[model samples]
Target: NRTLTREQVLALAEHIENAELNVHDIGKVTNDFPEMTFADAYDVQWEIRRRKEARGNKIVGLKMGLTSWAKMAQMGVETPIYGFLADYFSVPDGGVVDCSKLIHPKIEAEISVVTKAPLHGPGCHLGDVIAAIDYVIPTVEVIDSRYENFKFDPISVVADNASSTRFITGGRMASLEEVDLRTLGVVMEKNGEVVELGAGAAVLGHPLSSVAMLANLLAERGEHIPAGTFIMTGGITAAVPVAPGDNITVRYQGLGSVSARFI
Candidate 1:
């Protein structure tokens, strides 16, 4: 059971989600409600998602945050957290992203994929992930934190829906049959300047495992990743800041590349 009252969760949900909607920065919710537990954080996140659903926005996919061991330790947590993506969050590769919808947006190069079959957990493994994956993709995750100065605690970040924003995915796709998902490499450039580089292994050793871990976490909540689900397995490269007039491109070793321009 969560420590915060139901009214507190609802209020926090509005405060957080509205901040995201209006690009208005605010202080962390925990500053006023320090007793908010993990369950409370998730409750606030789910409420925001629920409100979006109620408004008729389609749920697009899922996103995982804090997948790296360093991030987990930095936040004093063991498991990764998640957020739901909406249809509007999908920005086509080489497309224009309006800064009118963001607050200090940052870009994270990531490995993304879609599932061929439903995956549930409690015992979800890498093998299950392999069997379920339809293909791997290269994407740029645009994260815009709702908190002022992007400064917030772990629980506060979770309640802000893992800082979910727009995601740009190249139309190109390749299956696990074509490449080794674990050793996949990525190079990122911002405005034609190389900013960060890494490989799929950077994401929990292998990006596929991020999906496996995410599937299992979803199961804990009595849900499952449905067939055809698109998932952004955490960032391969650390998030790089972006502002208006900035263009970002990230090339995958074999999965082509994705680009987005902010305006």
Candidate 2:
């Protein structure tokens, strides 16, 4: 039932982007466009990306969302979704995040991959993604949904770029040969207290698997993950809520740690 016309999709993308810039919550788009499908949602997302690029922002990377069982269960979705990342969305590791610009921001501990080679796939697999990865790094993603009470259907969230906001990556990097991602563990602490804990396998059983899925997804739209892309492989643990003056840190077993302060 992807009934949204092309112009309607553009208009909706504009509305969503406006909500994000204004730091305000709007009702889920699905409430107004009940017939919108996943296809329509991604169309709106790409339009939003185009709007940002037109404003001079460079596409930095991409991200996978709902890859973890916990996240998928909480969101009531059975599949993962993809999102775009722009250069402006990055915060340096150990930096401060301005809470004033986000509504109900939450953080998730995750892993990221920097690609050394392009990956295009209609039939991409883990080995293919592993071969393309230059290094793996620790990351913490701050997701803020632009919907009231953070309530939204999968389609609405997709249209909103999977709640993309800000992210930071640890300085420590490891090649696949140096680290076994499947068993790597991470402990997330908020204000010096452990809040969530999980292993890398929590990310779709293996983090590179998420990358492979992203490649296949992009191939559907005639796009491919390019070299030097820094892709976040979703959350390893459930997202934890944070507020101004809170300090967050995620320490990975072999990848050191990433920390951020909310102000």
Candidate 3:
């Protein structure tokens, strides 16, 4: 059970979001609040999201994290976590990302989609998820956790907004009619050498499954994903560490390529 009061949630929100805004790191909230539950973690995220909206930040979309079995195992989690994305977090494809804006950023390739029909939960499934999709686009997420020295547990990181930082969308937008999403492949390269590679199936056996899971999870709180909402279905491969001067590119099958220069 969660023991955090509304006051605690608000204070933790400010504390965590401040670290993000200041481009700094802080000790995990769990360091002091060891009794915080997953419900409390999500409440903190909601408070941080509300604070951002109050300050005129536009919530652009949602992102699923730790969807792969490998990622879940690495983080000692069984289910995927999610976070909201703001307009400022988007970096146009082929754009240069100033490393100064982030702390120890890592990149991972993802297949994102925008829905044409509202998707609700409780009974959301693959068929419903597939029919709601308008189109699919490629994206590279730049994740930077706010925990100092990268020390945190699954619950702590969830409260940190799933390390929501930046994302880059590729050029091509193919309809569900045009591609076999389950088999879609990507090759990620850094500078010039291949650093990671995977396919849509790597994301919970099919990226759409991530969205379905997201909707069902949101249903737990009586929430639903509205139509036309953009959704990142989680990274299909491991997150790769990057530093300044690293130029990265990921070539997607039938979806073109997304590139970024961390400078």
Candidate 4:
């Protein structure tokens, strides 16, 4: 468990919060302790989450972190990470986000799902993913690096909740059966210029695979991701950086569109 003391957990959470706000990156989070491990980072996350819960924030959904294979490779990791979301994290369609609150913000387009039934497992299949999903929508996530200049090793970022930040969701839910989700192409535009392009394959070769992985991990953690959960599978497009006064948009086949402005 990395052997972090309870007091350090609270201190690291506040430090991570500041890191998320772009103030500074006090490396390792457990630098004072030096013997900390990645598991300890998550322990801090759990502690932060518990405090949020104690303050009455609802866990609306789970965000699949580092779901893109390329991102994993960049981070020198083999699998994805995960983060919990509170009610305040959801930004309505077309909502403007104040850039002042984030550190080195970037954006990506992803396929999001609202589930109809609870599922957990060791070998969850794509069939289970489709059967469990109620509807899918196009979403744009405003990802802010909690690390300094988006620079952090896997453990550091994971401890910072996998760089999860504000998210804006739009478009409508469509049945996965009607669409070839893996082949679904995505385009990310900044100020009307297409800056990044990719396909759903970027996310574990099949977007739904991310959900399956999450399901299995949750089961191992003794927590089941429930039905009605808004799962953001991961970004299909490359993450493109944005600044204030920029108009960012995502266009996806079948799922339609989502857009946001940073100011």
Q: How does each model score on TM-score?
A: 0.96, 0.95, 0.96, 0.90
lDDT, candidate 4, 1-263, per-residue tens: 56777788788877786665454545555456557666777777766677678879887777787887777888787778877776777887778888887767788788888888987887886778878888787878877766654355666666777677878888767887777778888888889999988888888898888888888867756777688888888888878898999988788877777888889
lDDT of the candidates, in the order given: 0.88, 0.89, 0.89, 0.77
Task: Give the 10-residue window scoring lowest on summed lDDT in candidate 1.
Answer: 145-154
Where model 4 places Cα greater than 4 Å from the true spot, the runs are 21-35
Model 2 bad stretches (over 4 Å): 69-78, 150-152
On TM-score, the stronger of 3 and 4 is: 3
Which residue runs does candidate 3 get wrong by more than 4 Å?
73-76
Task: Residues 1-263, candidate 1: write the lDDT tens digits.
Answer: 58899999999999999999888888888888888887899999989999999999899999988878888888888878888898899999999999988988899998889999999897887888898999987888999889884444878888998999899999469988997877888899999999999888888888888888888888877889999999999989999999989998899997788998999
Tell me how far the alpha carbon of residue 217 in candidate 2 is from the true structure, in angstroms, after superposition. Answer: 1.0
- Candidate 3: C-alpha lDDT: 0.89
Error of 3 at 112 (Å): 0.3
How do the residues 69-104 of candidate 2 rate in per-residue lDDT, one tens digit apiece?
A: 666788777668999988888988899999899988
Error of 1 at 78 (Å): 0.8
